[PDB]
């Protein structure tokens with residue numbers, strides 16, 4: 674579109690020109706709040722054609738929102754970690770929504786992996802996945818990035834089942850208020866149920882809001898994808914958590930890992946651990962584990 678030339682110069686390194694990209698509109702991978710993700714293809718700097726996923730960003734109408742995203746996207750282009758999903762780049766078609774090109778992750782998301790009846794995950798298998806998420810997130814936090822929507826579904830699995838943390842950089846402070854709104858009848862899987870008590874009262878997010886969300890993610894892993902706070906009337910959730918009640922310890926979840934989960938859900942954000950400490954504590958648990966067993970589905 675007709676954007677500030679100075680901006681496009683400023684953000685050059687993120688941008689893939691639209692004529693280097695093919696989005697397969699007939700090959701939709703999936704749909705969600707922030708946009709649609711299609712199968713796609715793009716042309717390298719080295720001139721080869723690489724297949725990947727492409728997400729049309731449906732929540733960026735304003736030009737202020739476009740340029741803000743372009744600049745975050747530049748910082749995200751710099752993110753390099755084994756447990757973080759890479760940003761290939763962003764494409765602006767002459768008229769339309771910004772598109773985000775992402776590496777295709779061929780084993781899907783962590784939630785569907787764990788929910789699969791074709792699979793028989795052990796306790797230790799699931800804790801390991803959690804460990805890989807805490808490294809993804811430790812890096813993001815070190816790089817001054819706040820996810821805002823950490824959950825099992827936004828953790829992808831690559832060819833060799835390496836977990837990549839993903840869909841950070843989409844939700845924003847205050848502007849995406851409605852994404853974290855209450856009372857929507859079909860409420861079992863809304864982001865409200867993963868997000869920290871104080872973020873629900875301001876729609877401002879920090880790394881410590883991400884530590885809450887991680888705890889909730891770690892519960893999913895060990896329930897093999899149960900909805901959190903399932904039977905809590907959605908309008909009663911903030912009051913419930915203020916009472917100091919929390920998700921119950923999963924059947925086969927070790928006491929120590931539940932103690933970790935509890936630390937993540939501390940109501941004082943400052944009392945919650947850092948992801949650096951979480952990688953350490955969770956790693957220690959995996960090695961300390963005496964025996965192992967299968968976990969069942971809810």
Ligand SMILES: Nc1ncnc2c1ncn2[C@@H]1O[C@H](COP(=O)(O)OP(=O)(O)NP(=O)(O)O)[C@@H](O)[C@H]1O
Nearest residue numbers: 702703704705706710726775776777778781782826
């Ligand atoms: N890089 C990728 N490679 C493969 N699949 C992807 C990629 N990024 C997103 N997806 C999938 O695209 C679909 C839509 O993503 P999204 O709109 O974020 O849905 P979601 O609500 O976050 N997860 P879900 O529980 O599947 O609805 C999901 O099925 C994702 O697993």
Ligand SMILES: [Mg+2]
Nearest residue numbers: 826827839840
């Ligand atoms: Mg996602």
